[PDB]
Ligand binder design. Structure first.
Ligand SMILES: OC[C@H]1O[C@H](OC[C@H]2O[C@H](OC[C@H]3O[C@H](O)[C@H](O)[C@@H](O)[C@@H]3O)[C@H](O)[C@@H](O)[C@@H]2O)[C@H](O)[C@@H](O)[C@@H]1O
Ligand SMILES: [Ca+2]
Ligand SMILES: [Ca+2]
Ligand SMILES: [Ca+2]
Length: 536
């Protein structure tokens, strides 16, 4: 397999509005990000997946873009963007921009022209109809919004302020490629593609994800822009299966580097039910089966996996599948070890490296995400009390991943000097913060740092196969094998002691959050024990 710079890379996702505020408006900005590049360099990440910082009304906080080639006032300006690029590069960190082209803001110049002048070319940049079908919006309601100005419905799988682009229009696709090349020319390291598996949509036929022309568009996009370069492109694909992922990531297809698959995240809610009907108790056996399948199916020179626990749209891993009490740190380390030692490119969400958690939202007013507010509005009139609604939101609400990054124990956790922050800082910041984590030699931060270094200095993390071992339900163990080197990863994913009925000859310990020797010798695992040892 041809190796690229990103094959040894670990990506760090930054949610711009909640990373670092440098001008006291209570909202993170580009200068704030740039001011923390030394930190990220210490962590050792090679790239930053930067969520949207483009001009936007912020109806969906950046994913509703009004201008693909201008920075939103709140984040700063193009000069700030350029400096981030240059300062990051100087520290060996590439910037991966968030590519949101399945839709734009209804305040984008193209849509304004499409609505005001139905005969214009840009009218066809969007999807209109006289007779709407039953397609629904992901944020609630019909996916069709009637426009009384032109007397037609426009499609929007997301919010009403995010009209869908018409990917059947070759001229629209071209303008998207011109825009992508605008960014490529500035020296970015790649693109994270927002719900990219939706561009093959055919609404008339109720075809949304995995449309028939989907891969053809990606091949066309590749050839017209990033293909000739050596960038990292990761597509967000909810409708992806291992076979489809191969189509995406096998380099011979000339499409993407990898994609984000959400099969494991699916274990967070009852099957066939909205994410709001969550499941607290992680089904470890199911997880083993899912991870094992993706590690097995996407073999070398056949596909490449992306590895992640959470992002800006998901609950922080500790709150959903980890321990937020007595074993916060240990569980956090255990989950990090379990994921990063598999084959693929791991993604760390800001704050994950210090073990931040979800926020205890008390009422609707304290929220910001349109998705949560829409769900609440609808649930309230359908048999759900406000408390029940707030309980679901405290667990699954997207705002849980958007509270300010916790840097220290000062005001606003060192995130801002403002009276208040756009989203409230978690009270646990007094205990959970970057300064304290950097001070404690055995904090969660260093575990991530060590995992990152191992991946940067060892070919086996890339070349070794994956084999799931037969163990107790809550024990997640597997080996990575290449030639004659054998690495055993054992992670006790539970708050209880578990049995480890195995016998091996330990050669060396690569990383451990406990006494690996005692666990091996006693054939028992203390809660959240996690380690990787090279064995004979
Ligand atoms: O730009 C809009 C939105 O796009 C990305 O996230 C998409 C979306 O992903 C999840 O929902 C997808 C999932 O929703 C239901 O389950 C449907 O039934 C499925 O078909 C569909 O795959 C997530 O739950 C949403 O919150 C999220 O909006 C960006 O990452 C988002 O930030 C952005 O808002
Ligand atoms: Ca600011
Ligand atoms: Ca009218
Ligand atoms: Ca102040």
């Amino acid at each position: 397999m041809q190796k690229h710079w990103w094959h040894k890379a670990t990506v760090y996702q930054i949610y711009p509005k909640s990373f670092m505020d440098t001008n006291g408006d209570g909202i993170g900005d580009l200068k704030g990000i740039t001011s923390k590049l030394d930190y990220l360099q210490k962590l050792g990440v090679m790239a930053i997946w930067l969520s949207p910082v483009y001009d936007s009304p912020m109806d969906d906080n950046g994913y509703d873009i009004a201008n693909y080639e201008a920075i939103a006032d709140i984040f700063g300006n193009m000069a700030d963007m350029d400096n981030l690029l240059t300062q990051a590069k100087m520290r060996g960190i590439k910037i991966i921009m968030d590519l949101v082209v399945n839709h734009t803001s209804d305040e984008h110049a193209w849509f304004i022209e499409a609505r005001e002048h139905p005969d214009s070319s840009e009218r066809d940049y969007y999807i209109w109809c006289d007779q709407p079908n039953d397609l629904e919006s992901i944020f609630g309601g019909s996916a069709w919004q009637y426009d009384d100005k032109s007397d037609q419905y426009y499609l929007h799988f997301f919010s009403k302020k995010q009209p869908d682009l018409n990917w059947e229009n070759a001229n629209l696709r071209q303008k998207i490629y011109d825009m992508m090349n605008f960014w490529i020319d500035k020296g970015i390291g790649g693109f994270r593609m927002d719900v990219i598996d939706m561009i093959g949509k055919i609404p008339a036929q109720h075809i949304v994800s995995n449309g028939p022309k989907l891969h053809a568009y990606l091949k066309e996009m590749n050839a017209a822009s990033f293909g000739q370069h050596d960038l990292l492109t990761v597509g967000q694909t909810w409708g992806a299966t291992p076979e489809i992922a191969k189509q995406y990531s096998n380099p011979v297809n000339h499409e993407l580097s990898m994609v984000f698959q959400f099969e494991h995240i699916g274990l967070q809610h009852k099957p066939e039910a909205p994410k709001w009907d969550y499941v607290k108790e992680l089904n470890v056996p199911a997880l083993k089966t899912i991870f094992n399948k993706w590690q097995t199916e996407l073999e070398l020179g056949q596909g490449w996996n992306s590895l992640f626990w959470n992002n800006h749209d998901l609950p922080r891993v500790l709150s959903i599948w980890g321990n937020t009490g007595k074993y916060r740190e240990k569980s956090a380390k255990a989950l990090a070890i379990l994921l990063h030692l598999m084959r693929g490119t791991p993604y760390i969400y800001q704050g994950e490296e210090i073990g931040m958690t979800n926020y205890p939202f008390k009422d609707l007013n304290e929220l910001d995400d349109i998705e949560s507010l829409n769900y609440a509005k609808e649930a309230f009139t359908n048999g759900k009390s406000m408390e029940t609604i707030m309980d679901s939101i405290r667990m699954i609400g997207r705002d849980n991943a958007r509270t300010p990054m916790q840097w220290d124990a000062s005001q606003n956790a060192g995130f801002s000097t403002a009276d208040k922050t756009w989203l409230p800082v978690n009270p646990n910041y007094k205990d959970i913060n970057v300064q304290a984590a950097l001070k404690n030699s055995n904090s969660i931060f260093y575990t991530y740092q060590q995992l990152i270094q191992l991946r940067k200095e060892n070919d086996w993390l890339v070349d070794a196969d994956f084999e799931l071992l037969p163990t107790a339900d809550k024990v997640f163990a597997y080996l990575r094998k290449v030639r004659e080197e054998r690495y055993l990863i054992v992670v006790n994913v539970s708050d209880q002691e578990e049995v480890l009925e195995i016998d091996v000859d330990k050669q060396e310990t690569l990383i451990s959050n406990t006494n690996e020797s005692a666990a091996l010798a006693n054939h028992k695992l203390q809660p959240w024990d996690a380690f990787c040892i090279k064995i004979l």
